[PDB]
Design a protein around this ligand. Sequence first.
Ligand code: VO4
Ligand code: NA
Length: 415
Amino acid sequence: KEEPINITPEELDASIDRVTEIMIHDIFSPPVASRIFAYPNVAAYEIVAATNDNYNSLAGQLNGLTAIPEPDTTKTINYELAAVVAHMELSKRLIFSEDRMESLRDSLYMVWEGKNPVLFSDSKAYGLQVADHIGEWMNKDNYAQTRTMPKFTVDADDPGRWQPTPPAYMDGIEPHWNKIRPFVLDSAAQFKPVPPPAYSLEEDSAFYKELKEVYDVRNKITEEGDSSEEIQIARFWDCNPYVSKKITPGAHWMGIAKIAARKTNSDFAKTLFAYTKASVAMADAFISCWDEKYRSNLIRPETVINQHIDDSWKPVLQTPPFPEYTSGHSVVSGAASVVLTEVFGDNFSFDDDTEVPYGLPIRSFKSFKQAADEAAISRMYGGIHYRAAIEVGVKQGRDLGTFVVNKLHMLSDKK
Ligand code: VO4
Ligand code: NA
């Protein structure tokens, strides 16, 4: 039995789809999701870069990353197969419900092994060797240590400080996300933005005026009635697993990267190049954004409105359980759109069907940037951000993503 084994980008997509699903079932948060996407892409990309003269190794470019082992030249290895192996193995390690990765994996293994047991076996061994190397590095990123650090300390005596919001009143998510090793940033605070307008109920103050806009936008939306377009836009981008089945913003952008790669018929290495660069950038965008959320510790609009303006007002969207400034939707979309523009081009139009399996319709866009701008403004229609977190958050993600694409040297022709 010595048939060739044809590995397509769609088999990388099947691993990413599957981990996406399990992340939903397992209830991982938006910043933790971004870690789970990045490391398995890196391992798979390393295997391509070791064996393809057009792609440079990320070793020496990502913080702490050294060269992976080279393949044994006396073995016959399908490197894309090895790469899918390594992606699935690290995705398995990163989620909680491991048996749902293992069923995906075993069903592919069964066909590979049936077609060509020696090619399967040699390629799998190298993929796993490579996953062990990446996993040693990934296990030094301080994630394990932060798993036992203290919860965010809520204090009502501190007037502009973030409080848990109804219905669930969940404690703030990942208050020490800024202690995770970044991939590319010099430090987590590298893109620290300007501070938010000072919390104040003075009617002439910047903060009050922004408070009144959130309040007024929502009431204008009520007077327009359900359906409308602004409510659909807030819902499409919401991506909040704590509503009381949804994917996170990181996941949504991975789905957009997949749509672009398939629309262009990108081959396996091009597709993986795009996913790696996007997932790495989004992972540092989350670190950067969570760094600012937990520096400014800012109260979300509904709490201020209900306590001091109007006790019956409710945001169009349920408020996410973490501080306000800057907006994760803004920063993460901003970084992801800069990467994908750099990879696939300006005015890349696409139909975004990523939300079709989670309750929602298709929305079309003329460019990644238009989608990211929509993502950002959706948070104002949604009632859960003031304008600064939105606008400053876009600049933050754009600046961070520009830094990542100007730093990482991955595509690099032999020819
Ligand atoms: O994920 V947000 O920081 O846009 O509520
Ligand atoms: Na190379």
